[PDB]
């Protein structure tokens, strides 16, 4: 075996008593160990930083080894051989030199941490060795280590600046951070093992409950009063459905996608906020203040053209909440329809071709034309959007204000009790974390269609066609029925699809038909 | 001296590369490499490397190929030494491979100046994210889709130099391409001097580098893949193309870059894999031709092919027959007749005409699918981008000799129509199959096809067949569609290859791959020949069809399409000579196209007048 060099030793320190924001850092704090809380906006690729360098003198063949390097690349000051006076002609050897892994992870303060909403202060966090690829861009993380100052390499020779050392040249200092430790602050059996024993017991009890479906539907949006159909649709979407692809190659979408249209002051945006909070790997945004192409994908030049992660990727493998969908561009809606059933977002600009899986569930909230839902107006065209997209959408919820005095008094009392008692007013059947665990278990489950379930789906599709007797119902409606049946089987914890589940799916589709 | 292989098994050095570098161990390694090429034994007993040498002689290849697994099977010590120091093992291996190939074939060195061993079937593959600085300077396999492929360019394998102050002579320094030769010294005098390139001893080799990047599945979902460049060795150039998945066995290596250090804020070296070898990830067979002739029938083969066509689609059997005729195609004619057979499908949403077009995309040898909203005329013509400037071929140009696809029939319609009049989209060189919704909505019987889809009357005449479908709700039809769809969902579902057979449920009598290969065989191995008597009857029928079009049009282009569709029916029967029934069914297809045009307006009168004309037999 080859002779073994001395192993590099890394020392990581965690659970520091205090954590400071990027804005909290100061030039006086440099040179001391510190823990910083923030979100990693970007992470540099892992690189072999020249931690130790080995040079060979061309004049006398004398060789140096493992020379320490400053911020700039360095060479031996004098030839190791006393006879040779060489100070140049140093040729590096990759094998004799030792390189540590290198990765710079840009970070920024939390936007919520900023009091006035101002731009968060950004800090450069250096990840090396095991710290490289120990965090992900866009994920909040706490970094512990010594704050550092980066001199100008051009001033070194490789605003105010120090001079007279550099010599005549001024030297400007760039603050940075080196993180000794990195911590991220942001099958059914495998999920059960990941769950603690108490969590497994609670999930088992909830799954054993026969009213689990209705209980979850009620638990959706505890603060919101009414909109039980929207709650059931949200629960079905979060549960999801099994993906399937035909032998001919056509691939159906397993994720449920819905679009909600209703009058203002119906808390559709509140439902979107609750869904975004509940769904892992989810991103919420307002449609009016957004860029259509930027949401789907991003492209930028990196120090050469590169590809930046899009907003839709933040929602990948999870629900995507869309607020002010009517205010958003119909071009963006058509783009979503283009990347809804086929998914597979791709880039062809800047000369670089990139691919994106774009696998996510879509939820939307919108104000119908005229500022309020019109029952006389058809379900299609109340919110201007592509007809194939409307067909591919699993459901189209309708929200209408109820003039009933009892409902008005109930909503008023619920809002007043909320304002008085904070979270105590809400009484969801299940806790948010328990419902999330149930959703994960149901996602681990893959419902299977029964033969009686298939016959029931046939009958329900025939009934939907009779209701068309055209544009409202289609084979896409049948696909939505299958997806909702899978979601209902997941919610009821039944292993296989049932005719009753298909009946519930048809009932939800008929409610969308209105 | 030469050490024993058992003595070489222990590295006995600071590194395994140093062990290989030690001259006695290097001579022993060369002897062991020749002995290993001789020692690897095939099931026949001939050396696998010896058979590779015979194949290299027959191919006149400049580079020998040696499987890494074969080196593990025999001289596993040499294999491990290569895993540690692939270049150190591979230089001696290349010398040994040249010696073996020359021993097999005299003057093989005169044929090839240098024979280089190439790895094959490398054992372990590492992802780019899994690849690290420790992986650098050692051979590794990488599976990923190339981000881009640079074109092959001339490069100096070695470069002699001239010192301006000294004599105009220097050693032919080999160029590893990891960095500039950068001798930083004069050969004639031991001091720094200008080094103008000298061609007296310069060696020249083709060079190409294709950046390697992880596949989107290889990267975690929602995460952009890491990219590490892959370098093609000389004679390994142009092995891969941009955007192509490949598994490359290459030594990862890091090279210092000042700009990289400036961007990182710390000294750093750019990492690029250098492939010692590359292993990158529809024609009818002859046995397939025999089986296709056996399965084909003199009569009813068109019915079997129509049942096989559009297996995903339910109903639309006429559309299936038209698409089958277009896919079978016809022999080209040059002096009016076009070899390609054009098909058009129109129907309300849910007609699955687009599904039939997708099946046709599989059926055609090099099909390209496009839609009117999805593809512009100029965009489908070509794409232009900076390379320097370079051009990209259009989609219609990409689909050649295999039936092309069109949808949403208006820039794409201009590309189609300019193609139909021009015979050029750049020639489309492909049959046209249309799956267009009528007026962007559910089909209405009152609208003639020209109104339902904007097009040219000459385009309708040029189409070998035109199809129109009207939406309707029937109880039996709903039951059939529901049974087929539920069966398709169960088939696609994981719970339900024998399971794949029960999943297919014999929806198509002819398997789709076998039918596409049979259409290709009936287009290439079989060349349909129009029958003269059937053609005389068809010419009388074409005169009658023009007269009937005047009565209630029909064109010589439609008659030529009848000849081409007769060739297509002969292909469906795999007959070198077009049958009279083939010509009759082709006249029926052209008559169906004429009836489909202005359907509600003229279809009843056309059917009454053409009951005798549609089929000669």
Question: How many C-beta neighbours within 10 Å does residue A413 have?
Answer: 12
Chain-chain contact of B261 with A73 (C-beta, under 8 angstroms): yes
Distance, in Å, from the CA atom of B520 to the CA atom of B220, rounded to the nearest integer, reads 40
Distance, in Å, from the CA atom of B531 to the CA atom of A413, rounded to the nearest integer, reads 88
Of A99, A465, A474, the CB nearest to B269: A99
Question: Which candidate, A149, A139, A133, places its Cα nearest to that of A37?
Answer: A139
Chain-chain contact of B132 with A46 (C-beta, under 8 angstroms): yes
CA angle B324-B483-B303, nearest 5°?
Answer: 25
Chain-chain contact of B312 with A250 (C-beta, under 8 angstroms): yes
Distance, in Å, from the CA atom of A18 to the CA atom of A16, rounded to the nearest integer, reads 6
Q: Counting Cβ atoms within 10 Å, is residue A191 exposed (0-12), middle (13-18) or buried (19+)?
A: middle
Query: Spelled out in words, what is the top-level CATH class assigned to the domain B282-613?
Result: alpha beta
> A265 a known binding residue?
yes
Q: CA nearest B217 in A: which residue?
A: A357
Per DSSP bridges, beta strands A181-183 and A173-178 are unpaired
- Chain A residues close to B350, C-beta within 8 Å: 474-475
Decide if B383 contacts B391 (C-beta within 8 A). Answer: yes
Distance, in Å, from the CA atom of A304 to the CA atom of B101, rounded to the nearest integer, reads 45
Chain-chain contact of B490 with A475 (C-beta, under 8 angstroms): no
Q: Where are the domains positioned within chain B?
A: 23-124, 125-156+204-281, 157-203, 282-613
Decide if B246 contacts B280 (C-beta within 8 A). Answer: yes
Taking the CA of residue B479 and the nearest CA in chain A, the distance in Å comes to 7
Distance, in Å, from the CA atom of B512 to the CA atom of B392, rounded to the nearest integer, reads 31
Q: Which residue of B134, B135, B222 is the best one to mutate when testing the A interface, meaning the one whose CB has the most A CBs within 10 A?
A: B222
Q: Counting Cβ atoms within 10 Å, is residue A342 exposed (0-12), middle (13-18) or buried (19+)?
A: exposed
CA angle B47-B49-B50, nearest 5°?
Answer: 60
Question: How many C-beta neighbours within 10 Å does residue B570 have?
Answer: 30
Q: CA nearest A104 in B: which residue?
A: B264
Q: How many CA atoms lie within 13 A of B550 on its CB side?
A: 6
Taking the CA of residue A312 and the nearest CA in chain B, the distance in Å comes to 9
Resolution in angstroms comes to 7.4
Of B11, B265, B362, the CB nearest to A124: B265
Gap between the terminal Cα atoms of chain A: 77
Q: CA nearest A453 in B: which residue?
A: B486
Q: How many CA atoms lie within 13 A of A471 on its CB side?
A: 13
Interface of A with B in 275-314 (CB under 8 A): 281, 303, 307-309, 313-314
Question: How many C-beta neighbours within 10 Å does residue B182 have?
Answer: 9
Distance, in Å, from the CA atom of A425 to the CA atom of B496, rounded to the nearest integer, reads 48
User: Hey, what are B488's tokens?
Assistant: 């398709």
Chain-chain contact of B224 with A354 (C-beta, under 8 angstroms): yes
Q: How many CA atoms lie within 13 A of B616 on its CB side?
A: 24
> A267 a known binding residue?
yes
Discontinuities after residues in chain A (C–N over 2.5 A):
158, 165, 186, 303, 469
- Chain A residues close to B216, C-beta within 8 Å: 355-357
- Chain B residues close to A347, C-beta within 8 Å: none
> To which H or E segment does residue A38 belong?
strand A33-43
User: Hey, what are A312's tokens?
Assistant: 């839709």
Taking the CA of residue A247 and the nearest CA in chain B, the distance in Å comes to 6
Residue A406's alpha-carbon distances to A284, A403, A418, B306, in angstroms, are: 34, 9, 18, 64
Chain-chain contact of B260 with A47 (C-beta, under 8 angstroms): yes
Distance, in Å, from the CA atom of A381 to the CA atom of A276, rounded to the nearest integer, reads 27
- Residues in chain A, total: 514
Taking the CA of residue A304 and the nearest CA in chain B, the distance in Å comes to 12
Distance, in Å, from the CA atom of B231 to the CA atom of B270, rounded to the nearest integer, reads 13
Interface of A with B in 149-168 (CB under 8 A): 150, 153, 158
Per DSSP bridges, beta strands A181-183 and A140-151 are antiparallel
- B23-124 fold: mini-chromosome maintenance (MCM) complex, chain A, domain 1 (3.30.1640)
Chain-chain contact of A2 with B84 (C-beta, under 8 angstroms): yes
SS3 B390: strand
Distance, in Å, from the CA atom of B112 to the CA atom of A202, rounded to the nearest integer, reads 74
Q: Counting Cβ atoms within 10 Å, is residue B111 exposed (0-12), middle (13-18) or buried (19+)?
A: middle
> Is A111 near chain B, with CB under 8 Å?
no
> A262 a known binding residue?
yes
Size of interface A-B (CB pairs under 8 A): 190
> A264 a known binding residue?
yes
- Chain A residues close to B15, C-beta within 8 Å: 2-3, 95
Is the torsion defined by CA of B157, B162, B166, B167 positive or negative? positive
**Residues B208, B213, B214, B215, Cα dihedral to 10°:** -80
User: Hey, what are A5's tokens?
Assistant: 């060099």
> To which H or E segment does residue B499 belong?
helix B498-504
């Amino acid at each position: 075996s080859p002779e073994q060099t001395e192993r590099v030793f890394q020392i990581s320190f965690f659970n520091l008593p205090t954590v400071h924001r990027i804005r909290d850092i100061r030039s006086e704090k440099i040179g001391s160990l510190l823990s910083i809380s923030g979100t990693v906006t970007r992470t540099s690729e892992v690189r072999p930083e020249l931690y130790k360098a080995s040079f060979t003198c061309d004049m006398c063949r004398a060789i140096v080894d493992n020379v320490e390097q400053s911020f700039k690349y360095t060479e031996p000051t004098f030839c190791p051989n006393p006879s040779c006076e060489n100070r140049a002609f140093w040729t590096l050897n990759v094998t004799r030199s030792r390189f540590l892994d290198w990765q710079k992870v840009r970070i920024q303060e939390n936007a919520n941490e900023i009091p006035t909403g101002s731009m968060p202060r950004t800090l450069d966090v250096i990840l090396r060795g095991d710290s490289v690829e120990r965090a992900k861009p866009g994920d909040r993380c706490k970094f512990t280590g010594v704050e550092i100052v980066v001199p100008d390499v051009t001033q070194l020779g490789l605003n105010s600046g120090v001079t007279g050392l550099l010599g005549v040249r001024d030297l400007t200092y760039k603050i940075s951070f080196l993180a000794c430790h990195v911590i991220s602050i942001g099958d059914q059996e495998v999920f059960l093992n990941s769950l603690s024993s108490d969590e497994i017991n609670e999930l088992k009890e909830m799954v054993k409950d026969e009213h689990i479906y209705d209980k979850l539907v009620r638990s959706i949006a505890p603060a919101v009063f009414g909109h039980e159909a929207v709650k059931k649709g949200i629960l079905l979407q979060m549960l999801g459905g099994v993906h399937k692809s035909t032998v001919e190659g056509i691939k159906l979408r397993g994720d449920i996608n819905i679009c909600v249209v209703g009058d203002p002051s119906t808390s559709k945006s509140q439902f979107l906020k609750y869904v975004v909070g509940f769904a892992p790997r989810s991103v919420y945004t307002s449609g009016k203040a957004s860029s259509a192409a930027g949401l789907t994908a991003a492209v930028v030049r990196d120090e050469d053209y590169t590809i930046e992660a899009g907003a839709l990727m933040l929602a990948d493998n999870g629900i995507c909440c869309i607020d002010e969908f009517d205010k958003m561009d119909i071009s963006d809606q058509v783009a979503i329809h283009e990347a809804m059933e086929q998914q597979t977002i791709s880039i062809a600009k800047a000369g670089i071709h990139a691919t994106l899986n774009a696998r996510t569930s879509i939820l939307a909230a919108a104000n119908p034309v005229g500022g309020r839902y019109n029952r006389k107006l058809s379900l299609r065209g109340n919110l201007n959007m592509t007809a194939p997209i409307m067909s591919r959408f699993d459901l189209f919820f309708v929200i209408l204000d109820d003039c009933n005095e009892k409902i008005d008094t109930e909503l008023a009392s619920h809002i007043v009790d909320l304002h008085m008692k904070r979270d105590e007013a809400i009484e969801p059947p299940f806790s948010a974390e328990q419902l999330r665990r149930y959703i994960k278990y149901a996602r681990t489950f893959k419902p299977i269609l029964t033969k009686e379930a298939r016959s029931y789906l046939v009958e329900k599709y025939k009934e939907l066609r009779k209701d068309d007797a055209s544009y409202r119902i289609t084979v896409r409606q049948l696909e939505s029925m299958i997806r909702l049946s899978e979601a209902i089987a997941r919610a009821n914890c039944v292993d296989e699809i049932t005719p009753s589940f298909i009946a519930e799916a048809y009932d939800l589709l008929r409610q969308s038909i209105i | 001296e030469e050490l024993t292989l058992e003595s070489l098994s222990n590295v006995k050095a600071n590194s395994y590369s140093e062990w290989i570098t030690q001259p006695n161990v290097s001579r022993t390694i060369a002897r062991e490499l020749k002995s290993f090429l001789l020692e690897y034994t095939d099931e026949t007993g001939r050396s696998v490397y010896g058979a590779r040498i015979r194949t290299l002689g027959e191919m006149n290849s400049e580079s020998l190929e040696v499987n890494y697994r074969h080196l593990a099977e025999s001289k596993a010590i040499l294999a491990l030494f290569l895993a540690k120091c692939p270049e150190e093992m591979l230089k001696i291996f290349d010398l040994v491979a040249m010696e073996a190939t020359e021993l097999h074939y005299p003057d093989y060195a005169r044929i090839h100046s240098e024979i280089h061993v190439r790895i094959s079937d490398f054992p372990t593959i590492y992802s780019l994210r899994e690849l690290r600085e420790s992986n650098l300077s050692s051979l590794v396999r990488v599976t990923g889709v190339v981000t881009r492929r640079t074109g092959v360019f001339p490069q100096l394998k070695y470069v002699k130099f001239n010192c301006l102050k000294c004599g105009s002579i220097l050693g032919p320094f080999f160029q590893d391409s990891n960095e500039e030769i950068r001798i930083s010294f004069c050969t004639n005098c031991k001091s720094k001097g200008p080094f103008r390139v000298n061609g007296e001893k310069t060696v020249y080799r083709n060079y190409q580098r294709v950046t390697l990047q992880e596949a989107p599945g290889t990267v975690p979902p929602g995460r952009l893949p890491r990219h590490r460049e892959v370098i093609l060795l000389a004679d390994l150039v142009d092995v891969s193309k941009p955007g192509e998945e490949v598994e490359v066995t290459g030594i990862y290596k890091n090279n210092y870059d000042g700009n990289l250090n400036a961007k990182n804020g710390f000294p750093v070296f750019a990492t690029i894999i250098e492939a010692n070898s590359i292993k990158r990830r529809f024609s009818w067979t002859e046995e397939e031709e025999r089986e296709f002739r056996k399965i084909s029938r003199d009569r009813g083969i068109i019915d079997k092919i129509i049942s096989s066509m559009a297996p995903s689609i339910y109903g639309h059997r006429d559309i299936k027959t038209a698409v089958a005729c277009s896919l079978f195609g016809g022999v080209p004619k040059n002096v009016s007749i076009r070899g390609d057979i054009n098909v058009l499908l129109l129907g309300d949403p849910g007609t699955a005409k687009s599904q039939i077009l997708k099946y046709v995309e599989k059926t055609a040898h090099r099909a390209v699918f496009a839609t009117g909203q999805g593809a512009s005329a100029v965009g489908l013509t070509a794409s232009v981008r900076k390379d320097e400037w370079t051009l990209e071929g259009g989609a219609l140009v990409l689909a050649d000799k295999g039936v092309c696809l069109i949808d949403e029939f208006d820039q794409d319609r201009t590309s189609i129509h300019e193609a139909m009049e021009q015979q050029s989209i750049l020639q489309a060189r492909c049959s046209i199959i249309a799956a267009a919704n009528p007026n962007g909505g559910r089909y209405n019987s009152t609208l003639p096809l020209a109104q339902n889809v904007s097009l040219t009357e000459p385009i309708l005449s040029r189409f070998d067949i035109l199809c129109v479908v009207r939406d309707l709700v029937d109880e039996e039809a709903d039951e059939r569609l529901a049974t087929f769809v539920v069966d398709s969902h169960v088939r696609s579902h994981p719970e339900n290859l024998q399971r794949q057979r029960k999943k297919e449920e014999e929806i198509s009598p002819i398997p789709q791959e076998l039918l596409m290969k049979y259409i290709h065989y009936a287009r290439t191995k079989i060349y349909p020949k129009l029958h003269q008597m059937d053609m005389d009857k068809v010419s009388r029928v074409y005169a009658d069809l023009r007269r009937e079009s005047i009565s209630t049009p029909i064109t010589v282009r439609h008659l030529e399409s009848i000849l081409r569709i007769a060739e297509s029916f002969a292909k469906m029967r795999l007959s070198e000579f077009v049958s009279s029934y083939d010509l009759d069914r082709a006249i029926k297809v052209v008559v169906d196209s004429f009836v489909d045009a202005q359907k509600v307006s003229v279809r009843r009168q056309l059917r009454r007048s053409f009951a005798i004309y549609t089929l000669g037999h």
